[PDB]
Amino acid sequence: SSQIRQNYSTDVEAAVNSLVNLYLQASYTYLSLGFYFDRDDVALEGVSHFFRELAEEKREGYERLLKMQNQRGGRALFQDIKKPAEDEWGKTPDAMKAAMALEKKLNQALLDLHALGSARTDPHLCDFLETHFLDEEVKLIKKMGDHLTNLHRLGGPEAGLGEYLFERLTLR
Amino acid sequence: SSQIRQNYSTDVEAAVNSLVNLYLQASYTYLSLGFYFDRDDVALEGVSHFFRELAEEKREGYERLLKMQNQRGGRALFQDIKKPAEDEWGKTPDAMKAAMALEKKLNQALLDLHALGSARTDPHLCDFLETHFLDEEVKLIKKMGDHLTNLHRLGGPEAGLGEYLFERLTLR
Amino acid sequence: SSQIRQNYSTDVEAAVNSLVNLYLQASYTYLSLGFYFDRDDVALEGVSHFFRELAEEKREGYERLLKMQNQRGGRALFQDIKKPAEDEWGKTPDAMKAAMALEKKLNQALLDLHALGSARTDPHLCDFLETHFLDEEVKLIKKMGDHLTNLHRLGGPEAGLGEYLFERLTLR
Amino acid sequence: SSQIRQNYSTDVEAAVNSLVNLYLQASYTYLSLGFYFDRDDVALEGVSHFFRELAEEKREGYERLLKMQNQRGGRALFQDIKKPAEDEWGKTPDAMKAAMALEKKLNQALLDLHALGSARTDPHLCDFLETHFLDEEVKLIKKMGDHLTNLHRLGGPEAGLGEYLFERLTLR
Amino acid sequence: SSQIRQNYSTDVEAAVNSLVNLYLQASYTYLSLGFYFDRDDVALEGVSHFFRELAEEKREGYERLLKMQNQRGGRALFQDIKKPAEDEWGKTPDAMKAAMALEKKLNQALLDLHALGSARTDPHLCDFLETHFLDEEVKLIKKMGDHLTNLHRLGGPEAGLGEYLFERLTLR
Amino acid sequence: SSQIRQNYSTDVEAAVNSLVNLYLQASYTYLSLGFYFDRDDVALEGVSHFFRELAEEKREGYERLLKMQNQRGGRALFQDIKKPAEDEWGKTPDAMKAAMALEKKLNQALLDLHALGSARTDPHLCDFLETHFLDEEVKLIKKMGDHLTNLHRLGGPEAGLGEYLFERLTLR
Numbered sequence A, B, C, D, E, F: 001s002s003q004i005r006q007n008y009s010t011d012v013e014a015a016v017n018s019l020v021n022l023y024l025q026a027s028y029t030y031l032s033l034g035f036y037f038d039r040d041d042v043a044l045e046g047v048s049h050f051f052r053e054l055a056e057e058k059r060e061g062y063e064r065l066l067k068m069q070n071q072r073g074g075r076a077l078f079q080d081i082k083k084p085a086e087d088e089w090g091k092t093p094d095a096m097k098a099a100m101a102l103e104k105k106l107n108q109a110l111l112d113l114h115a116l117g118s119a120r121t122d123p124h125l126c127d128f129l130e131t132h133f134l135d136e137e138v139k140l141i142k143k144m145g146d147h148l149t150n151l152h153r154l155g156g157p158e159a160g161l162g163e164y165l166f167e168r169l170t171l172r
């Protein structure tokens, strides 16, 4: 019986905690991706930095969610964070495709939470996601799509050369 | 027949003017609270300043509402501003609880107006409240709840000592 | 039985609280005037700003009075603030005439309070009004009289043109 | 089959492209208005600058829309841009009235697109319009209404004098 | 019967308005080119920026023409702006070739207008085109020719790699 | 068969990955502690900040470990991160005691890894822990012990008052 709680559905409270878990899992996946591309036998510095920056973005994500949960009088419930689906992430096109699929999964969870908040008439939640999450995901999915198009353009039997040039001239 | 008016419901226009009155009443209540704690026999400077700052925040509230009313071609209708419910506000926990109840009443009016604007399909109104009012109230209600928890922690037979320390070390 | 109270008449204490109400009502009237001239079908920006600045001056008025009331060991008693006498204020000459009448009413209340303080031998009150209120009202009534003379000079069948030029070149 | 497209209705995609056309047409109309008032036999510099600035605002409008269309995986489809409805725009009140009607038409298209996005459950679109378009149009329609009120105030047999003074003292 | 008009042929006046239309159409074509290369499945940022900058150059073109038309006492007559000939512009060599053909068409119209002005003995027009248009087109056509030569040099079965390197190292 | 690997035991490689998991779990526990003390019904800002800073310190811990793992030609193997042992952490003495026990567990794992590296004759590992981890833990355990002593000193029936003063004057 939180003293500050006002028109904050338990369904929304639970869905927020599930989204916190998904973002924790996403940060952990990008941690693994970043350190895989820091391996001596992969050695793509710009790719590692790209995924390491995303792990921090996902970290700021669930931290913002947890701040909002407390602002609204909800209660954070933390669950186990599943390990990444892969230990080895292959080459840069395979890794970017996995990151693309992850961000789309996060985007679908955000849109479902917005739809839940609308059904429960929670405008603070809906505007909170609109302000901090929805456009961020749209922009990131666009950038990953641009990267995948250029990587496909740089494909073929010169794929290794293309991988090097992409890291050097697009990702630094 | 305002020349600029476009998809601005009379129900919304009236509800905005009622919310202007509620904010005028809220500012007036915080005026009384601020000067009560400036009394020589109460003498809690940080508490007076806390409530005096809120009276200004409520003032910027109804001024923003009145600006929006004119932007949308609505017409401000001013009614009498009721006096505060109390002349003497007791001790700091009692005053903070009254301020908490006031902000929750304002928040409920904001959420009802948002629900009205959604039913009437008024997205400018809905985004206007989301941008300027809804998060402000959530943040303020959270801060008041934090204050009440610390005041309860500082309660007991040392309540006067606790009241002094709260004003000195949390509210300045 | 305020510990600090020294030669502060209850008649003066009551008259101060009545003057606080009159100043609250005056600020509220100038709020309505300012937003009336911000309407799209009135659209006189300098006139709105002129009255909006006066609402703040009246606000600093009753705040100074309430500070003095506490300094002298008196107790603020807040009453309902009556709405403005008009919802629509006509043209700039009609509005300035109403503001003139309001300031004269405030001035007469100030002079009556000074006369009461003199009869009750309250020199702090009398000097307080002399220092902060009496000259302010004399100056403001003079400026409004100057505005009304120029508005009458700019009257006639070119009144709309005169109203525009007054707002542009005198009031900004 | 855009790789990035996620919950972006084809109805919304088409409506965005239609709104891009309406904004292209609006910019073109304000181009004509600006250069009409730069004619030697009209010669109202502030009026020309007012409409020339609006043509740029409409340009930033459809550019923002086209950026969003690509961000969401939609595809821009450009159609012919219709010429302005008039070659000669009369006097400043007639021109401002036409600009008013144009902005109201744009506002109605924006509100219809928002209603479509809500029906299709597209919160990124709805917040995109709320953030960048809806308040901009409300503010602009208010300013045009203010201009029309002052122009009507400056009307009568001194209309030419009023037109000159409006351009000199309001529009520069 | 413009009061300022002096030795300004109606044939020249009409030809200027036709050139204004051609420049409006050219800007619109470069708008489409710029946003096509901003698509996620094309994703060539330097190419999009190259064509977006040209749309602004064509915009400054017809604005200069319209300013001159008013300076000489001519009257702007705006017609419908035809949509671009293509919705999809293929790869960078195909797009640059289309932009090349467009600039050559604009250059031929400029040279024809200069020839008309010479036949009509209009030295202000002829020098106006010489100062602001003719060298600009010669320089731009040269740069596009340089780009096409390098793109052809970077062709072959490594065309995708060549396209990426051209955008990265020549166009940014 | 990493090309760079030189005298890096598989036992050490595995123990490093286990320590990475323990540090990930430690950061997650301090995340929960920080947001628990940000709850409206706990409301101890300095305590939340204290634990939030520690979550970042543990984050820099496993990041340093993962960097070292790649430097030595080892391979990171990520496992599931267990949730914190508690959802609610009680009062500040109970939370500090849990953080104390956690840091001692981390310290014991560090000392065991150092002992393993010494047995396997891995001086880079041993100096790496000495330089970056061992003194950090000794300092932190000392500070927590100091906090617990002061919290016990501030205990008794004035425990709530003591909790407030500790947060205000030691932890900010």
Ligand SMILES: [Ca+2]
Pocket (backbone or CB within 6 Å): A126, A127, A130, B126, B127, B130, D126, D127, D130
């Ligand atoms: Ca919104």
Ligand SMILES: [Ca+2]
Pocket (backbone or CB within 6 Å): C126, C127, C130
């Ligand atoms: Ca005196």
Ligand SMILES: [Ca+2]
Pocket (backbone or CB within 6 Å): E126, E127, E130
């Ligand atoms: Ca020449």
